[PDB]
Amino acid sequence: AECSVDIQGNDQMQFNTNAITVDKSCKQFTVNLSHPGNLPKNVMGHNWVLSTAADMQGVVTDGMASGLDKDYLKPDDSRVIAHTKLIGSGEKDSVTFDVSKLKEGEQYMFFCTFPGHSALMKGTLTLK
**Residues lying near Cu ion in the complex (CB under 5 A):** 46, 112, 114, 117
The smaller minimum CB distance to Cu ion, of residues 112 and 127, is found at 112
The smaller minimum CB distance to Cu ion, of residues 102 and 113, is found at 113
User: Any binding-site annotation on 26?
Assistant: no
User: Any binding-site annotation on 112?
Assistant: yes
- Reading across the β-sheet that carries 4-8, which strands appear in turn? 4-8, 28-34, 92-98
The smaller minimum CB distance to Cu ion, of residues 44 and 127, is found at 44
Kindly tell me the number of DSSP H helices and DSSP E strands found in the chain: 2, 8
Shortest Å distance, C-beta 84 to Cu ion = 11
Strands (E), the chain: 4-8, 19-22, 28-34, 49-52, 82-83, 92-98, 108-111, 122-127
Q: What are the phi and psi torsion angles at 44 (to 5°)?
A: -140, 45
The smaller minimum CB distance to Cu ion, of residues 22 and 112, is found at 112
Residue with the shortest CB distance to Cu ion: 112
CA angle, residues 51, 20, 111, in degrees to nearest 5: 40
User: Any binding-site annotation on 117?
Assistant: yes
Annotated binding site for Cu cation: 46, 112, 117, 121
